Symmetry: C5
Subunit: 338 residues, 5 copies
Amino acid sequence: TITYTSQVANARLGSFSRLLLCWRGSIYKLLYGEFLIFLLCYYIIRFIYRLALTEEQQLMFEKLTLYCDSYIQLIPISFVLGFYVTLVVTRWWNQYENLPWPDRLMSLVSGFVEGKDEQGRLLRRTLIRYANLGNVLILRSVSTAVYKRFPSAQHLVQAGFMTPAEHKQLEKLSLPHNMFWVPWVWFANLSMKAWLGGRIRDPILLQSLLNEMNTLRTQCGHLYAYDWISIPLVYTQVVTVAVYSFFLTCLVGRQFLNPAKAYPGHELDLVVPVFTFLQFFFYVGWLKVAEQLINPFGEDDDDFETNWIVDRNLQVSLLAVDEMHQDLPRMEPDMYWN
Amino acid sequence: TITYTSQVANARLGSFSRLLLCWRGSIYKLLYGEFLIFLLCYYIIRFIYRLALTEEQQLMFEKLTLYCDSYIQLIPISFVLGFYVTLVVTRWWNQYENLPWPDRLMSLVSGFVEGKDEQGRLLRRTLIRYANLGNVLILRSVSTAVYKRFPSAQHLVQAGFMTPAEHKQLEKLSLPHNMFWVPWVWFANLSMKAWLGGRIRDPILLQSLLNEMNTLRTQCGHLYAYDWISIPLVYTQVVTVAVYSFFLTCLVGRQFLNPAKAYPGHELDLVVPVFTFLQFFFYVGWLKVAEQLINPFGEDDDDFETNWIVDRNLQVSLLAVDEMHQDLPRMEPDMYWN
Amino acid sequence: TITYTSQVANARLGSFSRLLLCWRGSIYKLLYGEFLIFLLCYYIIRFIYRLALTEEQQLMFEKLTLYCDSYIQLIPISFVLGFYVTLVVTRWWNQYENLPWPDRLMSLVSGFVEGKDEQGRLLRRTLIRYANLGNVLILRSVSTAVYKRFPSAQHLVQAGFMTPAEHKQLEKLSLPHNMFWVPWVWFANLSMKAWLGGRIRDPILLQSLLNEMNTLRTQCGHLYAYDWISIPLVYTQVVTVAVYSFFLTCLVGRQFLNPAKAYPGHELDLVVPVFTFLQFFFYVGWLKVAEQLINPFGEDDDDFETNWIVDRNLQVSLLAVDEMHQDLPRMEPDMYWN
Amino acid sequence: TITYTSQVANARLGSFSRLLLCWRGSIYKLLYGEFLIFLLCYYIIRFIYRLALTEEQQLMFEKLTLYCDSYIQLIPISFVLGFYVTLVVTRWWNQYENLPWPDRLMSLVSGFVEGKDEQGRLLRRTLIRYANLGNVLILRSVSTAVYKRFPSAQHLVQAGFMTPAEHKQLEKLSLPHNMFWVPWVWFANLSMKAWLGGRIRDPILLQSLLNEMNTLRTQCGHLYAYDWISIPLVYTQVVTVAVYSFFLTCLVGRQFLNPAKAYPGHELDLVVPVFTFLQFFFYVGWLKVAEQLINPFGEDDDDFETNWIVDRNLQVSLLAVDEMHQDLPRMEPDMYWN
Amino acid sequence: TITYTSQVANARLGSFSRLLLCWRGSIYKLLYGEFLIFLLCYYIIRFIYRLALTEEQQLMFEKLTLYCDSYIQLIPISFVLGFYVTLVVTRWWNQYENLPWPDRLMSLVSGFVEGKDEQGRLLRRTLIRYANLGNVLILRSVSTAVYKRFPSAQHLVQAGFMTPAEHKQLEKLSLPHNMFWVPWVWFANLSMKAWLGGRIRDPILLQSLLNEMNTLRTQCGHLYAYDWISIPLVYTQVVTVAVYSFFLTCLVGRQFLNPAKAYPGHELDLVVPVFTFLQFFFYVGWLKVAEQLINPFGEDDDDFETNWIVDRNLQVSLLAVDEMHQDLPRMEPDMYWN
Ligand SMILES: [Ca+2]
Ligand SMILES: [Ca+2]
Ligand SMILES: [Ca+2]
Ligand SMILES: [Ca+2]
Ligand SMILES: [Ca+2]
């Protein structure tokens, strides 16, 4: 993701005008290639019309240009594209809200699971590891970035998410469907064992651990759902057709006809169709933003930093439950004490 | 459902343009039959006008064409169709969010319900079976796909969702209304029996089981609600009338009048009304998407894979609570251990 | 309600086109009377203009017709009516989501409240009855259908919702405001008595019962809120004025002027203003849908089946907690067992 | 609030047309004064133009009228006003959903807090009083109606919400900020004392009491938030400017020019600009509805009955926990018993 | 923030018209500098056109003015700006809802954590301090105002949020990422220690403390998310380009051409383009409101009073748990007692 929230903390002169000079995560980066293809086609058509067609061919071309410019408005481009973009943006933020953070769980696993010995350490680390393993198994499914980082389960084994025992146990349980759900069943059985073994003192704390873990399940499930149930392919096809039809008809309708013939609206020849390029910038940029956001777990500049999230989550989880377990700052009176 | 989320992970040149070449779940599949009927009617009208009407009849037809094309905009097609489609898409995603997944419950039933003997196995399998049975009873009500798979309760008996004892007990409890609610009462009474019999060690875990099961009830109830309370038939009728009236008036208003008479906007005869066909594609495609999504539990390409969900849920539930109960990977220090 | 969800399970040719031939719950049923009044007024005005006015009177009428048709667009009918309808539809579905279903509670009352003797039966039936009584007291307030079924509390007594003791106890507690809240206080005091008397074994189950009951309270409260706080009367008045002003000005603006005088847009006389009737169908139908949905607890075809819900809820609640208490199907291994 | 939900239970002929004849809470009441000022200004301008200006002055005035009527559409009145009104209506209903009702809490305080003696009565009444006191302290902050009823804390003391001891304890704790939060800390410390003193038998019930009370806190906090964080003053200023600029330009643009000069659109002089008055009714009425709803805790006809809510809440709370504690109807078999 | 909720409690004549005379938090303050730059450029262009260009240059300029004014509508300024502003306003209110208030937690810490001695005081103050420290660590990240108040952790130490021991313990745990999460792990380990040490009597109260604290975590996480995941930079760039392109083309298209040449729409020269300035006020004001709200934790007039919130929260938390612990008003019968 490209963050600029600090830069726009206060309304000031120009404001978003300083943001126009940004390349990474910008509309220019998303639009230049399609724009250059449109620019080439437009000028090829202009050159064909001006230096290839005969007089009667030029008259026919001019009729077709006035016809196309007249029936540009039949295309409900605003209608279709507005609907599509609102759908994509809603889904994008819903996808971000369902990224699982183990912080609520790691605080409970650090507090409730007793023992400063080797076995307590191992139990706490393995519980949070199950939480982080569940998240990374769902993320490698839903994220092309994470999958490229972890092409197989053995890659998770060499990265600390999975032990060899865990790996072979998952291979034994292999089912045709996705097996991201397994660490939750592992977490429940391990936490029950811990409670029965006296490492968890009361089953109310055990209830509290399982609720936090199940919250993460529900978030992972939402991620699974957004990956599986795409925006209906009909809508993507329709909005794609709307944008392409609009600019394909602009390739002819927005030519500068011979100003000698004094057609209404064609009196002045400016060579560069500035307003047509502005409409391309707005409409195609708008579509290209939707193309970027439709799967926010790709490798786009403004896609979520899913690998960063995975690494941070595992580091913070292991710190919080191993080194921070019953390690507290000395409790001393504050500055406002008396 | 047709999933393409991986294909659109990154914004790239064309992007959704590769999706235009997809047939399954496509706008072409939804539109071709209605489009071919519209195409036939339009050209029949053109041929009648050009080779059947006399001169004065042609003048009257031309007057009617200019009148119809002038009063095409009285039809609030964008207004009505936008409202309808937003309603349908909201309901569609709400319907997906209320598909019950037993994962939260199966982890609790695997952890809390004690015993590696025959009776423990049987108790855990029957509890998750009650959850899966409740889901399949509601789904066969709300889903034509599931109902075709399970025309009667005996079909559920031969598929492992229902035992003969369960089947005869449901026949004894028969009420005029839908009896999807029964497995929840079975689950509560069995879980209470389990707790009293010592298979559940503490009533806090019993509370936790009943909360998860009741969550699934609330999801099933939402599914029942969306199946029963249709989008008001007035709205479907109105949007249907709007789209059909628009294209029925286009059948005459969008004819290419005699270019000899030099009517304004009718100077050029292109035979093929490209913009009228594009408007058909946008508006009728938009309606046909709503027709597909209005009941997402049908047998449409882009409808939910409800049978797949049912089979997966039962397989994963039974695995998680029977074979995964107190079967844990050997707890060994991770790669980051020290 | 009129349900057609099964009929529209798959996108097919015509699709909603088979729904056009439905009378119950249809736009035709909602529109015919107002439409027939509009049809009579329009033709009366046409006949007055054509067979009553003198030549100079006809010229003045024609001026007024062209003026009215020109300033039809000043009326923000789409603006106002779109806002109103989105408000009504949101509130309509929110009202449905807050219909209380005792299923979550009846499963807990069947499981937790112990005793197969007379006193256990009586206690379980009275607890669910308090839940159903609270719902029917709020529903008879918010629903004209339920109130017509139960004009007084004695009608609830003869229908099994209320005992004579309960009736006289409510008469003793009479307050100026609505007393739907009383069964919740009864439920809490009875459930506490049950727990102290040993019919509920652990206060965690007692907590679980009170949470479910309080959920139903919060739903009933929402119903109370939607009944009391109407859509602001200003909005209903404004949208009513917008629709009526639009069609009152159409009564004159949409007349077919003398085609002899060759007014622009009045060249062709079709007698029947098809597009004006289509606009009536869209706009007035749209308003009439809002009039139907604004109170979904009336006796409209597409209003909620509140009496059906009340009867079903009481039947299912009493079955679930009396006949289904500790009556379980014989637990036998499933088909997938081994 | 003005409630008419019963009146609109069924769609019928006219429907909202009977609501047009309502004065209290009506658009007429909100619009008449501004409308009468607009009506006076319009006719003053007409009289100045017709009986004060010379011929060349009349020509200049007519030029300015045609200019103004031409550039009326530059004002994005629909854009701005639609955005503003959707914001206001969302906030209005969110404000209503966060009015705290003690019903969930009063049922728990009636059930859990034991003792039919003086001390039990006093403890239960004081707990619900803390809940009602917290609500009335936040409401007198956010509601001008409640503040006028209770100008000082001593007014709360004479109305039964606050005891003299409670009053002096709040005066001792005085902080620069609002002290609505204090009764929640009182409720928690009193409920803990009650539990330690054996009036609450189990800490699970104590947990249940504190959760309900904290829910009311979160609702009161939302009310505090909506009172403090106004709709941004920029939006109110902009929508105010949009509506006023539109009608100030209508004062000249919508004059009926001399019909002798036969200006396009000015052929017919009707003296009364019916469509301009209709646009005033729609747009200014729409703004005035937003002005009414922007603070729903004022003394407007359609503002919430906050004083009624406060009185009802205290009466019902005290009844439910004092007179209804362990007072149950005799449990007798229902009509459906056997 | 600028609050005026009390001022608009009732709909009255003018209403928001008294708000037009407000400078702090006003549209005038947000618009004047950009407006003055636009005003200078417009009049410079007018003076160049009127007193610098030759006759043929004036004809060319007039052609370009009529071209620009004709193709002003190609810019989807309403489309783009409406989408952007709805996104910003949603995010703004979501950001406010996720400001953490310790009131729910401080009531539980005051009630549950026992002891009127030094150690009880110290334990209660340190628990709420951990809650307030977590909030201030996230706020100094997401808020430029708080960061300017607390440039380093030592500034938090001198302000009472952090003890020197806490400061050195955080320095020892330093990770590359943000360490706002640490006080939650501290809170969980301290609350567990308190429970084991008998200061918390039952683990149900311990569960209740950890749930409240974890709620605050989830709110802080949302704040972190809104700070990190900006509105996509593509949208800000596009809306910026739309507004600037619209007014840059207005600089030429909205000039008053020579009225001698009697161009259509240019008959009257008013020197001041009132409607162009009104459109600037609406559109640029609308953008500038979005610029103000996009980061509501800056130092803008209408930005959240985050420093005030932080100070209030710490003062109220410390009061509630130290001075208000087991300090209750004398429980005496209320005015309605009997
Ligand atoms: Ca992407
Ligand atoms: Ca379907
Ligand atoms: Ca109704
Ligand atoms: Ca108000
Ligand atoms: Ca700001």
